[PDB]
């Protein structure tokens, strides 16, 4: 429900300055009315008898009026631009605040360029509001002042313009929808181009490492050709529209010339009155001509509002703020959890029931295919269970604040993408204002202190884009530190040790007893050596907890799946 | 107009095709010349089809004898008094009486046969009210008697200049 | 038309709740020290251009009144 | 194409010069001599030119 | 003016003090405007109080010539209107005096204009000294006799086009 009805309250809020702008526009129209009166007086009274004193006073008055009109027009433009920039700032802030709150399901179905294009075309509304379009509209709608005077001059050439105006309206109505559609197509092409460019620049490593320069170049060539063709169609339609406007204006001017000549020859008007009438008619048609060269801007702004609504009309993660849910101690329960990726996909988790208490270092094992890779995204509210409900501390997560929940749990993944900052900034990303003492402590805990130190910049090294400057294990040890800086009540290891050599995994398992001090730790790994020292071990097969218990109680049964997996691993 | 971008339009802008086309041409390779020729032809046709023209006052004055001969008694020749401007005073009417055989004076030229013209007594209304016409005056009485196809404006200077040897 | 009716209804409803969506009045120094976007949102136009415009329109009004008398 | 554009531009400039001349002839002859049948020719030529 | 650099002058120019003062102003922020407004008001006072004179351009010489009738009416018999002979330059020959006799009711001629009522003026016999010695005045001549009769304010002189236009 994001429309120009959103712009209405913003207009009402600055109604006072907008009324000031309306008054200034009326007075500008008054000055523009005064000037042709001076031309008519000069033509009809200074040249007929004689004139050297009336001419001089008219000249000085005209100079003063011109200077004042220029200053007033500049002030009006400045005030209007200020007032509209305030509104566009409001709109941009609201748009980004809404964008950051959308669920990851929204982002997984789109491309980065697709959703960057709308935030970028916010600049279209930004340019329109701080432009000459609305000032020209105000000038056009305040043109009855000139009609009231030309009716006094002549009640026939006035109806000429009064009947010309509906021709302008009809031409505008006829030519609007076609260029609206063409600009819609052009925006679609632009979004595709932006998505392709963003994806190509992001993945330049794969493009260059492989041999696919020609394929990317061919795709770019086709996309650019299509985009330029659409732009040319838009340009052609705009040119046709403005040429039609010119045709209407000039045929009206010719008819007025004929009628005014016959009127003057017959004595019901004078030469000076005819000249003044021509100037007034030109002054009325000037805003229409000025508004016909920014037609693409009007239609593009309509499309801009439509696309910003497309982004802004999506449902967000429901913020449930009341009673101020307190800090949690680790207590995770799964109650008949049934989960599938897509409603047209096989069920992953059938009937998982689970209970994790405080201080319990839980280990979850299985083969590729089980549902152990989705629990880390179920504890976080990234996956919505189809059936059942997940509870932390007895409170259901379906009615809990996502920001409050995700600030308590620290999840270390296998990829662990980083941001384009320094080592200390990335490690302290969850809280940029943190002292070096905690950074050092976390780096020592994760075992990354040494490598960071051996560097030349130390903890100030820029990792590049997505941490490209660091290896797979270095990013892993930076992610572990980043998860450990701000004390998480629940810490999850989702196959975070498989991307490391022996002499780093051993360090992590040796520091684990300090890592899990007063914490609830869940460890998920393909291997079984990582979880051999956990409080409980849980085996999952095709999304079903088959058996659970201690390591010895699991290995004691030769018929168990865990014994088979241990034999295969060894 | 309301046609989406087809495939031919995309091929027209394909960089691979533009690289192979050296010394390219415009889409309408020969429309501007056609329109210029059409405008010139229309102007020429319009040129050869367009035709462009105290009480007992007298406008007897210098003028071509053939011009007076083309005019007839009672021709519409208006009179403009100098007392005031043409717009303010108005263009009154002075019926042209037959031009006398004898010229009024030979100072201006030979063709000074004094085409006398008298007002109609119904042209000067209350607005003018210039009853004191001051008969010793030469109010300009425009006498229009004939029209020449505009193209005759080209016929006059060039052809006469060619005539002299 | 029909969309005009919707726009008129929205405008009237918002104008009824008018005077309850006005930012609090603040001094020049208070507005200068705000969050970056809030400063732009809540800083009104300077008084000097308003005064100059008022002087221009007042001069025109005085001129047209003096001329007619 | 650019030579074609230059030719069209100079012809457009020549076109824009006609209208002030027509206004002058109307003001100087049509109003003064009460010259109908000349205003019509100017009107038709102006329509063609525009 | 002869005092050395005091501590106030150095403290006023310290970088620490200048860095904190954002959007600074001149030492005396209201001296330029004060002087400009003073010049404007003095100019207006001088224009309104200032006054400017108005000059209108053989033995029994006469300067009877074209001139505004109101100008002659403002003048009186015996007014100071000098006469400049053309025989020689104004500087070399001198600006002699020609007392203005009353202008006759009938105009001398109607060729120049209607206001040609011929303000006759005769010399005083004591202006043309031995330096001029132009006894052969050649009475068939029009020696320019400047006739000044009136004074006009500067502001009225500048504003007169405004009041003339009716
Ligand atoms: C070659 C001939 C070129 C002549 C120059 C043409 C200039 C046309 C006039 C443009 C003025 C319209 C632009 C508005 C600018 C307002 C800037 C502004 O308000 O900033 C504020 C300053 O406001 C002002 O000074 C008022 C501006 C009045 C414009 C005076 C125009 C005279 C210019 C010379 C002619 C800054 O905040 P503040 O001082 O605390 O109050
Ligand atoms: C409701 C009363 C309003 C009547 C106003 C009629 C205005 C019609 C003026 C047309 C002049 C446009 C021609 C300029 C060049 C057009 C570019 C072009 O050739 O595109 C080509 C052809 O374009 C056209 O000529 C479309 C003409 C539409 C007529 C309506 C390619 O398409
Ligand atoms: C009391 C009237 C005070 C308000 C004065 C308004 C006149 C100038 C306001 C400039 C509006 C600039 C915002 C704007 O144009 O948004 C543009 C479109 O805004 C709108 O559509 C506003 C729609 C207004 C509906 C009014 C319905 C008529 C009811 C009476 C988009 O950009």
DSSP string, A490-526: EEEEES-STTS-HHHHHHHHHHHHHHTTT-EEEEE-S
Give the residue from E151, E160, E164, E150 showing the smallest Cα distance to E72. Answer: E150
CB half-sphere exposure, B153, CA atoms < 13 A = 10
DSSP-assigned letter for residue B55: -
Rounded Cα gap, residues A441 and D9, in angstroms: 75
Contact A519, A491 (CB under 8 A): yes
Q: Tokens standing for A555?
A: 């290995």
- How many DSSP H helices and E strands does chain C contain? 4, 0
Give the residue from A10, A12, A3, A22 showing the smallest Cα distance to A86. Answer: A10
Contact B84, B37 (CB under 8 A): no
Q: Tokens standing for A34?
A: 């005064």
- The total number of residues written for chain C in this structure: 69
Which atom of ligand 1 is the closest one to the Cα of C48? 41
Cβ neighbours for A457, distance < 8 A, ≥ 6 positions apart:
A422, A423
Rounded Cα gap, residues A202 and A465, in angstroms: 9
Rounded Cα gap, residues A100 and A317, in angstroms: 10
* Ligand 2 site, residue A251, Cβ cutoff 6 A: no
Rounded Cα gap, residues D50 and D42, in angstroms: 12
Q: Long-range pairs for A510-514 at CB < 8 Å and ≥24 separation?
A: A511/A445, A511/A446, A511/A447, A512/A361, A514/A445
Measured CA to CA in angstroms, residue A153 lies from A141, A262, B137, D34 at distances of 21, 15, 35, 21
Rounded Cα gap, residues A486 and B80, in angstroms: 103
Contact A406, A380 (CB under 8 A): yes
Rounded Cα gap, residues D50 and E7, in angstroms: 79
CB half-sphere exposure, A438, CA atoms < 13 A = 16
User: Is the Cα dihedral C17, C18, C21, C26 positive or negative?
Assistant: negative
Q: With breaks defined as C to next N over 2.5 Å, after which residues does chain B break?
A: 53
Q: With breaks defined as C to next N over 2.5 Å, after which residues does chain E break?
A: 57
Contact A227, A186 (CB under 8 A): yes
Rounded Cα gap, residues D26 and A43, in angstroms: 17
Rounded Cα gap, residues A66 and A391, in angstroms: 75
Contact E122, E139 (CB under 8 A): no
DSSP3 helix / strand / coil % (chain C, rounded to 5): 70, 0, 30
Q: Give the CA dihedral B68, B70, B72, B75, nearest 10 degrees.
A: -90
Rounded Cα gap, residues E12 and E16, in angstroms: 10
Q: Give the CA dihedral C12, C16, C19, C22, nearest 10 degrees.
A: -40
* Residue A132 CA to its chain's centroid (Å): 25
Rounded Cα gap, residues E146 and E84, in angstroms: 7
Q: Where are the alpha helices (DSSP H) in A316-386?
A: 376-379
Q: Tokens standing for E157?
A: 């002189």
Q: How many degrees, rounded to 5, is the angle at CA A132 between CA A126 and CA A136?
A: 130
Contact E151, A39 (CB under 8 A): no
Rounded Cα gap, residues E20 and A247, in angstroms: 62
CB half-sphere exposure, A145, CA atoms < 13 A = 18
Rounded Cα gap, residues A306 and A8, in angstroms: 16
Rounded Cα gap, residues A48 and A66, in angstroms: 26
Contact E128, E96 (CB under 8 A): yes
* Ligand 1 site, residue A75, Cβ cutoff 6 A: yes
* Ligand 1 site, residue A74, Cβ cutoff 6 A: yes
List, in sequence order, every beta strand (DSSP E) within A97-251: none
Q: Tokens standing for D27?
A: 């003001």
Per-residue exposure over B129-152, b if at least 16 CB sit within 10 Å of its own CB, e if not = ebeebeeeeebebbbebeeeebee
Burial level of B67, CB count in 10 A (0-12/13-18/19+)?
Answer: middle
Q: Which ligand is nearest to the CA of B32?
A: 2
Give the residue from E122, E45, E138 showing the smallest Cα distance to E83. Answer: E122
Q: Tokens standing for D39?
A: 């205003």
Q: Which residues lie across from B117 on neighbouring strands?
A: B96
Rounded Cα gap, residues B77 and B96, in angstroms: 6
Burial level of A166, CB count in 10 A (0-12/13-18/19+)?
Answer: exposed
If you search the block for the tokens 């000059």, which residue do you land on? Answer: E55
**Deposited experimental method:** cryo-EM
List, in sequence order, every beta strand (DSSP E) within A198-315: none
SS3 A356: strand
How many A from CA of C52 to the centre of ligand 1? Answer: 9
* Residue C57 CA to its chain's centroid (Å): 17
* Ligand 1 site, residue A258, Cβ cutoff 6 A: no
Q: Tokens standing for A103?
A: 């669920």
Q: Tokens standing for B61?
A: 């004055």
Contact E97, E124 (CB under 8 A): yes
* Ligand 2 site, residue A240, Cβ cutoff 6 A: yes
CB half-sphere exposure, B134, CA atoms < 13 A = 7
Sheet holding B92-96, edge to edge: B78-79, B92-96, B117-119
Contact D38, B52 (CB under 8 A): yes
Residue of D nearest to B90 (CA): D32
Measured CA to CA in angstroms, residue A358 lies from A1, A59, A183, A489, A490 at distances of 45, 92, 59, 9, 9
Measured CA to CA in angstroms, residue D19 lies from A244, A257, D42 at distances of 19, 11, 10
Give the residue from A415, A500, A411 showing the smallest Cα distance to A466. Answer: A415
Cα-only R_g, chain B: 30
- Mutation test of ligand 1: which of C29, C49, C52, C54 has the most ligand atoms closer than 8 Å to its C-beta? C49
Rounded Cα gap, residues A237 and A14, in angstroms: 36
CB half-sphere exposure, A226, CA atoms < 13 A = 18
* Residue A52 CA to its chain's centroid (Å): 65
Rounded Cα gap, residues B72 and A327, in angstroms: 117
Cβ neighbours for B139, distance < 8 A, ≥ 6 positions apart:
B57, B59, B79, B80, B81, B82, B133
Contact B82, B67 (CB under 8 A): no
If you search the block for the tokens 């004094």, which residue do you land on? Answer: B114
Given the DSSP bridges, would you call strands B51-52 and B148-149 parallel, antiparallel or unpaired? Answer: antiparallel
Number of other residues whose CB lies within 10 A of the CB of residue A50: 10
Burial level of A53, CB count in 10 A (0-12/13-18/19+)?
Answer: middle
Rounded Cα gap, residues B108 and C39, in angstroms: 86
Q: Tokens standing for A347?
A: 């069920």
Rounded Cα gap, residues A64 and A85, in angstroms: 32
Measured CA to CA in angstroms, residue E59 lies from E96, E125, E135 at distances of 13, 8, 8
Q: Tokens standing for A132?
A: 């000459």
Cα-only R_g, chain E: 30
Q: Which ligand is nearest to the CA of A18?
A: 3
Enumerate neighbours of E (3 or more CB pairs within 8 A).
Answer: A
SS3 C21: coil
Please report which helix (H) or strand (E) contains residue A240, including its range: helix A214-265
Work out the minimum CA distance from D7 to partner chain B, whole angstroms.
9
SS3 A352: strand
Domain boundaries, chain A: 4-312, 332-569
Please report which helix (H) or strand (E) contains residue B78, including its range: strand B78-79
CB half-sphere exposure, A262, CA atoms < 13 A = 11
Q: Give the CA dihedral E147, E151, E153, E158, nearest 10 degrees.
A: -20
Give the residue from A543, A544, A538 showing the smallest Cα distance to A565. Answer: A538
Cβ neighbours for A131, distance < 8 A, ≥ 6 positions apart:
A294, A297
If you search the block for the tokens 């990234």, which residue do you land on? Answer: A382
Out of D27, D36, D43, whose CB is closest to A254? D43
Q: Tokens standing for A522?
A: 């869940």
CB contact under 8 A, A254 and D50: yes
Contact B97, B117 (CB under 8 A): yes
Contact E77, E153 (CB under 8 A): no
CATH 2.30.29.30 corresponds to the domain A332-569? no
Give the residue from A402, A368, A374, A364 showing the smallest Cα distance to A546. Answer: A364
Protein residue with its CA nearest to atom 14 in ligand 1: A75
Q: Tokens standing for E79?
A: 């007014």
Q: Tokens standing for A309?
A: 């609504």
Phi and psi (nearest 5°) for A207? Answer: -65, -45
Please report which helix (H) or strand (E) contains residue A391, including its range: strand A387-392
Residue of D nearest to A248 (CA): D50
Burial level of E121, CB count in 10 A (0-12/13-18/19+)?
Answer: buried
Rounded Cα gap, residues A423 and B70, in angstroms: 106
Q: Supply the CATH classification number for the domain A4-312.
A: 1.20.1560.10
Contact E77, E119 (CB under 8 A): no
Rounded Cα gap, residues A179 and A195, in angstroms: 24
Q: Which ligand is nearest to the CA of A242?
A: 2
Per-residue exposure over A359-375, b if at least 16 CB sit within 10 Å of its own CB, e if not = ebbbbbbbeeebbbbbb
Burial level of A469, CB count in 10 A (0-12/13-18/19+)?
Answer: middle
CB contact under 8 A, E164 and A53: yes
If you search the block for the tokens 């033509």, which residue do you land on? Answer: A43
Work out the minimum CA distance from C12 to partner chain A, whole angstroms.
10
Residues 432-471 of A with CB under 8 A from C: none
Q: Tokens standing for E37?
A: 């407004």
Phi and psi (nearest 5°) for A462? Answer: -80, 125
């Amino acid at each position: 429900k994001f429309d120009f009805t959103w712009f209405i309250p913003a207009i009402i809020k600055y109604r006072k300055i907008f009324i000031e702008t309306l008054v200034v526009s009326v007075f500008l129209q008054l000055f523009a009315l005064i000037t042709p009166l001076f031309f008519q007086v000069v033509m009809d009274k200074v040249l007929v008898h004689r004139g050297f004193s009336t001419l001089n006073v008219i000249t000085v008055a005209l100079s003063v009026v011109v200077v004042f009109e220029i200053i007033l027009s500049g002030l009006r433009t400045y005030i209007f631009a200020h007032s509209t920039s305030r509104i566009d700032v409001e709109l941009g802030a609201k748009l980004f605040r809404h964008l950051l709150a959308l669920p990851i399901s929204y982002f997984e179905s789109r491309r980065v360029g697709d959703t960057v294009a709308r935030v970028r075309e916010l600049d279209q509304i930004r340019n329109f509001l701080t432009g000459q379009a609305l000032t020209s509209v105000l000038d056009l709608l305040f043109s009855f002042i000139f009609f009231a005077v030309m009716w006094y001059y002549s009640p026939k050439l006035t109806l000429v313009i009064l009947f010309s105006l509906p021709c302008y309206a009809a031409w505008s109505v006829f030519i609007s929808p076609i260029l609206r559609r063409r600009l819609d197509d052009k925006f679609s092409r632009n979004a595709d181009n932006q998505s392709f460019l963003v994806e190509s620049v992001t993945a330049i490593n794969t493009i260059k490492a492989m041999a696919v320069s020609p394929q990317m170049t061919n795709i770019w060539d086709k996309q650019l050709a299509g985009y330029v063709a659409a732009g040319f169609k838009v340009t052609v339609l705009a040119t046709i529209g403005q040429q039609g406007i010119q045709l209407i204006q000039k045929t009206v001017m010719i008819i007025n010339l004929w009628l005014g000549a016959h009127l003057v020859i017959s004595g019901d008007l004078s030469i000076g009155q005819l000249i003044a009438f021509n100037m007034l008619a030109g002054q009325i048609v000037a805003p229409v001509i000025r508004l016909a060269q920014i037609w693409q801007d009007f239609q593009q702004v309509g499309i801009s509002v439509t696309r910003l609504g497309d982004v802004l009309n999506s449902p967000t993660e429901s913020y449930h703020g009341k009673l101020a849910l307190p800090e949690i101690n680790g207590n995770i329960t799964f109650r008949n959890i049934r989960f599938r990726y897509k409603p047209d996909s096989p069920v992953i988790l059938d009937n998982i029931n689970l209970s994790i208490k405080q201080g319990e270092v839980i280990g979850i094992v299985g083969r590729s295919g089980s549902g152990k890779s989705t629990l880390t995204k179920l504890i976080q509210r990234f996956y919505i269970p189809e059936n059942g409900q997940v509870l932390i501390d007895g409170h259901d997560l379906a009615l809990a604040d996502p920001n409050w929940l995700r600030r308590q749990v620290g999840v270390v993944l296998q990829d662990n993408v980083l941001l384009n900052r320094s080592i200390i900034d990335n490690i302290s990303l969850a809280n940029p204002g943190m002292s070096v003492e905690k950074v050092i402590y976390a780096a020592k805990l994760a075992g990354a202190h040494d490598f960071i130190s051996e560097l030349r910049e130390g903890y100030n090294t820029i990792v590049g884009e997505q941490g490209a400057g660091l290896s797979g294990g270095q990013r892993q040890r930076i992610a572990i530190a980043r998860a450990l800086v701000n004390n998480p009540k629940i810490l999850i290891f989702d196959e975070a040790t498989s991307a490391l050599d022996y002499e780093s995994e051993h360090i992590i398992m040796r520091n684990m007893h300090k890592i899990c001090k007063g914490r609830t730790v869940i460890i998920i790994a393909h291997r079984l050596s990582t979880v051999k020292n956990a409080d409980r071990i849980i085996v999952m097969e095709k999304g079903k907890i088959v058996e659970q218990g201690k390591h010895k109680e699991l290995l004691s049964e030769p018929e168990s799946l865990y014994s088979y997996l241990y034999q295969l691993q060894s | 107009l309301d046609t989406p971008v087809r495939e031919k339009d995309e091929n027209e802008f394909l960089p691979a095709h533009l690289e192979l086309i050296e010394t390219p041409v415009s889409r309408r390779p020969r429309l501007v010349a056609y329109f210029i020729m059409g405008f010139l032809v229309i102007a020429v046709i319009l040129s050869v089809l367009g035709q462009v023209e105290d009480d007992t006052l007298e406008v007897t004055a210098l003028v071509q004898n053939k011009d007076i001969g083309f005019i007839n008694v009672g021709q519409n020749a208006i009179i403009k008094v100098e007392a005031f401007p043409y717009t303010r005073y108005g263009y009154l009417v002075g019926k042209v009486k037959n031009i006398n055989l004898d010229a009024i004076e030979d100072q201006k030229l030979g063709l000074v046969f004094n085409v006398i013209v008298s007002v109609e007594e119904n042209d000067l209304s209350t607005g003018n009210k210039h009853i004191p016409l001051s008969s010793g005056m030469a109010v300009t009485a425009e006498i229009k008697t004939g029209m020449r196809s505009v193209i005759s404006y080209l016929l006059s200077p060039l052809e006469e200049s060619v005539t002299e040897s």
